[PDB]
Design a protein around this ligand. Sequence first.
Ligand SMILES: COc1cc2cc(c1OC)OCCn1cc(nn1)CCCOC(=O)[C@@H]1CCCCN1C(=O)[C@H]2C1CCCCC1
Length: 128
Amino acid sequence: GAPATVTEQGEDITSKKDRGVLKIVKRVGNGEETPMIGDKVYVHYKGKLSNGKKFDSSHDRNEPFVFSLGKGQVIKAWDIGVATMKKGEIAHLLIKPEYAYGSAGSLPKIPSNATLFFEIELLDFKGE
Ligand SMILES: COc1cc2cc(c1OC)OCCn1cc(nn1)CCCOC(=O)[C@@H]1CCCCN1C(=O)[C@H]2C1CCCCC1
């Protein structure tokens, strides 16, 4: 599946090179710019536990997911991964627990030591 393909082919985009955040570009975006810290970012996404036991989508509200990059409004893996994306890009991310919810998890929704997968479309970003 998509998650295994990321395990096998996915670029390690962590600073520490600990394979905590693996990325595949699935559709190339436009222009050179990628968002900066503080930028307002607009995305569509689908997400799941790698266990496929819980599945979440912005599509479920028909409306984009909006957050400020690098403020830790989202898990660390997103601040890291969406920062590498161009406008219009779709990427797959596979995420170890250290860059998601950790040993504590986020129960009852997310268990301890959970690996997460997302598909993310970067719709737009705009400055603070
Ligand atoms: C841990 O709780 C949740 C996890 C997730 C979605 C959740 C959620 O309930 C609060 O509700 C959807 C609405 N939403 C999104 C956020 N806050 N609420 C952003 C901060 C938390 O989410 C994150 O940082 C990441 C990245 C941005 C999209 C959402 N996300 C998630 O971790 C998802 C998970 C749901 C279960 C399957 C994996 C993804």
